[PDB]
Point group: C3
Chain length 243, copies 3
């Protein structure tokens, strides 16, 4: 790849050199390797979470009696796990021969935690078998160990899919980079009240912006629109997971 | 490009290998070749199609007496063909010498059809000379032959522009990949009723999300904002094509 | 990178070869070099500029008595300059060793001007020290010299950040390419009246679409959501710059 020409930045004013943590450099290398290896498309969608939000907030009591804080992430994890089982091409990697897909029969999902030293993505194993408060506890633990440098490399491995949630900071949508060898990543942004047509008038519904980046060698455009559509459907009524 | 490190996926659970159809592998190679060769920008816009939709629906009679189903795609094709003639840089390819553009004086447009074996993009020739019901019949035929493996390689060649419509499945917008050597591709997503300011109050207008990816070596940001703006203008009143 | 197979475009109809200006070829090379070197993510946001717009329009008198036209660009420049100082990682470049960031202690910002011969990005030096009408005059001058080929290469150098505004043509959002060695670029699209929930009803507020592309080796997803969030905050009340 043609390199970027060096510039003497000090010709234009005062500069200062700060160094990169090894964690940032590892991260830098991994993203650029994904970038050049995966042809990326982002599919955007927004889900109606008015009812999900009401549930979240009502179970604040239960969650606190169990010591966890029920946020939107355990709900996101549960729903993507159900869906990764319904649409198995999202739960696979491209074989090194380029001629086969390795479909995984397990569902472990990573989630982005941004710490001082860099971004870490802890992995929760067998998300499909854990409950909303179990996933809530685990997420919280892994996030804390990630911030406190106590996260052993074991827990950063063998994920099938990544969720990256920035809803707690802001933004309308973003285009995340697929953490290869996984084949998709779900970006989640800030929810806001939007007017939604009820067939007769605009009702305010709470809308969650979803941004699915995927590896289009493996997942074609229609399979991906169907994944964010099913996800939007499941988050609008999470009871559909029960059937 | 640095390769992706191989992972033993079976350390984390049960895996299964399914293979790729040759069609998927061809597709995979073409997309990655486009990805590394074309610096991509997506320009998003949404067009007001309330009136277009009313027309579509009124001519259901005519369309059925002629045996075709008038969908939004013949209308999209007709309008982009008019525009590919008004803005000829969108109807060209970059010469192999990198120092010239080959401007095409013809308008053939491909459209994405997603079949079981992979994605196919049949090409309708001289879209600029065919009528709405002609284009409707042709699209329908090519889509059927594409699904039934009866599409001869002849019909996959020499397109000037691609339309990729996922509006029938869902989504708010996506970032399509330019099928090089073409220089742009129009992604179309699901139409929904949106509140639009009439200078005094919000009126519900039916809005179609447009996502124009382009090769920014050939098309600069302003030329592309002007293309989706003219397209939004033409779809809001398709009679402008008549003049 | 695998090359794109040559096609005989004249098999499908009449073609014509127009050549590229050296300016376009320079531009083409720079964008493709950025594309392959920088892993890109776009963060989207929209800012409430109802009040900013009212101010702009009230100071039409002052602006005209000073000979400049106060547009949204001097306001964008002032606010990003304040922010490039608050969040210094946005005002830096990656060292050639890949292991350090060169943080710049100066703020010069470039802005995209699209001319007949290609795109130029003049640089305004020390934007942080100039006032709204100063920046207004300077922008206008540089834009004119850029269109009239009288822009000396000196003024295209040593920028820290780029603003690319297409709001005057149209569009909902786009994904700009980072002009490496800079680490971010702000795309600005067309403002429109949107319904925004006041906690009780939807109020029409004038909304400006912001599209921040960044180099995710240097800037992680959360730092970027926080930059467009602070920017949206500053444009909703530009008096916050005063404190």
């Amino acid at each position: 790849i043609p390199p970027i020409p060096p510039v003497d930045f000090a010709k234009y004013g005062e500069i200062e050199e700060v160094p990169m943590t090894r964690l940032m450099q590892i991260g830098a290398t991994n993203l650029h390797r994904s970038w050049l290896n995966v042809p990326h498309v982002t599919q955007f969608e927004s889900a109606d979470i008015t009812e999900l939000e009401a549930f979240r907030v009502a179970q604040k009591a239960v969650a606190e009696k169990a010591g966890v804080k029920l946020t939107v992430l355990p709900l996101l994890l549960k729903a993507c796990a159900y869906l990764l089982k319904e649409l198995p091409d999202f739960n696979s990697s491209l074989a090194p021969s380029g001629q086969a897909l390795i479909r995984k029969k397990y569902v472990h999902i990573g989630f982005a935690v941004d710490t001082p030293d860099g971004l870490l993505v802890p992995v929760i194993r067998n998300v499909d078998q854990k409950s909303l408060l179990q996933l809530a506890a685990e997420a919280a633990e892994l996030a804390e160990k990630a911030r406190s440098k106590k996260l052993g490399a074991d827990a950063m491995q063998g994920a099938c899919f990544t969720i990256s949630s920035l809803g707690h900071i802001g933004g309308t949508a973003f285009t995340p980079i697929v953490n290869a060898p996984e084949v998709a990543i779900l970006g989640v942004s800030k929810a806001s009240m939007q007017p939604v047509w009820d067939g007769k008038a605009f009702q305010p519904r709470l809308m969650l912006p979803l941004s699915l980046s995927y590896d289009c060698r493996v997942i074609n455009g229609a399979a991906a629109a169907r994944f964010t559509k099913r996800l939007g459907d499941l988050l609008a009524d999470i009871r559909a997971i029960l059937l």
